Amino acid sequence: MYVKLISSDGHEFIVKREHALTSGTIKAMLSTNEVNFREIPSHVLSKVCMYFTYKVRYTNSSTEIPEFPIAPEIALELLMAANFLDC
């Protein structure tokens, strides 16, 4: 039910397995219950996990969807990780 995503700097993020299987790349690195991301630091990986909760919450709900915030200071590293994970 939960899996552990580990950032390049050793922070451990524990998210629901369904939220993590939203990434095809993560599904493959599990297909074990831990994934080590040698290239993604914790200020990026935390945003990735916030995005999982946001997507699962707001896909197919037609209320009003708020904007997903991205601070400029992290935008480029986040893009690099999103590109690699096909998030």
């Binding site: 922070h11 524990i14 630091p41 914790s42 935390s46 909760t53 699962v56 997903f68 590293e77």
Partner: protein, 103 residues
């Protein structure tokens, strides 16, 4: 209403959700299922304030408008060694590099 949370201890961060009406003790049961430590060995904090087991998350200030899916509220977690609780502490995340000159 659902409230969205980050439960944090040291270098550990749990992303989970709960109901505004659920209790601090029920949140401790969620942590127990994940980190395999009983509630008796756990203390939960909003910032520096210790949270009482019988209190609902809404009364400790976790509301649907502050504990949001894209911006979850942080709950501090501290463990108990044998007797004696460790102090509360949370390793900060890494820092972003200097914004490029472009931008």
């Amino acid at each position: 209403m659902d409230v969205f949370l980050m439960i944090r201890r040291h270098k550990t961060t749990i992303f989970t959700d709960a109901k505004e009406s659920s209790t601090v003790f029920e949140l401790k049961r969620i942590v127990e299922g994940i980190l395999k430590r009983p509630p008796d060995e756990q203390r939960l904090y909003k910032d520096d304030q210790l949270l009482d087991d019988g209190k609902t998350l809404g009364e400790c200030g976790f509301t649907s408008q502050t504990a949001r899916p894209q911006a979850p509220a942080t709950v501090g977690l501290a463990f108990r060694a044998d007797d004696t609780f460790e102090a509360l502490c949370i390793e900060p995340f890494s820092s972003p590099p200097e914004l490029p000159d472009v931008m």
